[PDB]
Amino acid sequence: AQYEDGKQYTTLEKPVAGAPQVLEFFSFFCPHCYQFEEVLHISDNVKKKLPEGVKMTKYHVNFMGGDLGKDLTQAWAVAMALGVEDKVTVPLFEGVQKTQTIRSASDIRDVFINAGIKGEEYDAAWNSFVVKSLVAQQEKAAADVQLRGVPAMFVNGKYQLNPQGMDTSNMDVFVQQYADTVKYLSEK
Numbered sequence: 001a002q003y004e005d006g007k008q009y010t011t012l013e014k015p016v017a018g019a020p021q022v023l024e025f026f027s028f029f030c031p032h033c034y035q036f037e038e039v040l041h042i043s044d045n046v047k048k049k050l051p052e053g054v055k056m057t058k059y060h061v062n063f064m065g066g067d068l069g070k071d072l073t074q075a076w077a078v079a080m081a082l083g084v085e086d087k088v089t090v091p092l093f094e095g096v097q098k099t100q101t102i103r104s105a106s107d108i109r110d111v112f113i114n115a116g117i118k119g120e121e122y123d124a125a126w127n128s129f130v131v132k133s134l135v136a137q138q139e140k141a142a143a144d145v146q147l148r149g150v151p152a153m154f155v156n157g158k159y160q161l162n163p164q165g166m167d168t169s170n171m172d173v174f175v176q177q178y179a180d181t182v183k184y185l186s187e188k
Contacts, residue, residue: 007165008181012158016144019157020057022046022182025142025150028072028096029064036151038093040171045179046153054186058085059138061150065096071105072096077134078112078125087115155185 005011024043026033036042047056060076062069072092079085091111095102102108112122125131145154153161166177 003181003184007162008177009155009159009162009165009185012145012154012160014146016154016157019141019144019154021054021156021186022050022056023141023145023154023157024056024058025061025145025147025152026058027061027064027069027150028076028092028102029069030150031097033151034093034097037089040175042151042153042175042178045175046182049179049183051183051186059141061142061147062139064150068103068105071108073138074126074131074135075105075108075112077131077138078122080134081125081128081130082117082121084112084115084117087117088112091115153182155182156188159185159188161185 003009026037043056043058050056060073062073065072075088075092076085079088088111091114092102092108095107095111102111109119109122109126113119144157145152145160155161161178161181163174163178166181167173
């Protein structure tokens with residue numbers, strides 16, 4: 001057929017109950033993740049095609065970048081708690097990978113301050129149990145899909161996007177196929 005298990009996607013041996021409908025994993029340390037988000041704009045293209053009543057969820061992972069990597073997962077939790085994901089995603093990617101001016105937790109915080117988040121508000125979030133649970137939630141999700149690498153996307157806790165089995169030549173057909181596959185899986 002057009003969409004085939006083992007080609008554009010694979011199926012989890014162990015489906016995850018209660019998973020977000022569309023779940024992306026990434027790291028701000030991840031070069032392919034920078035490409036995915038900042039050049040290919042995969043998340044944005046996926047979202048432009050999703051069925052009504054389907055939300056996209058994005059989680060950060062700890063396993064790249066050591067101590068800073070975990071700081072970034074905690075900062076992403078702050079972004080989720082404050083609802084400022086779309087104001088900090090670009091300057092965090094650029095801070096870690098382009099300018100490389102993000103080398104400490106303080107440097108991450110500066111990105112939020114610069115983007116208009118009050119210090120008091122960032123600090124209260126950073127130290128909150130709500131954020132600690134959001135960090136735990138991201139970690140748990142990684143375990144549930146038995147995550148091995150990033151970037152990664154899973155649909156309805158059952159299917160895993162397989163960019164390996166798509167075409168890689170024009171960025172754009174690749175991006176269109178990826179987005180089209182997510183839409184297909186979401187209705188499956």
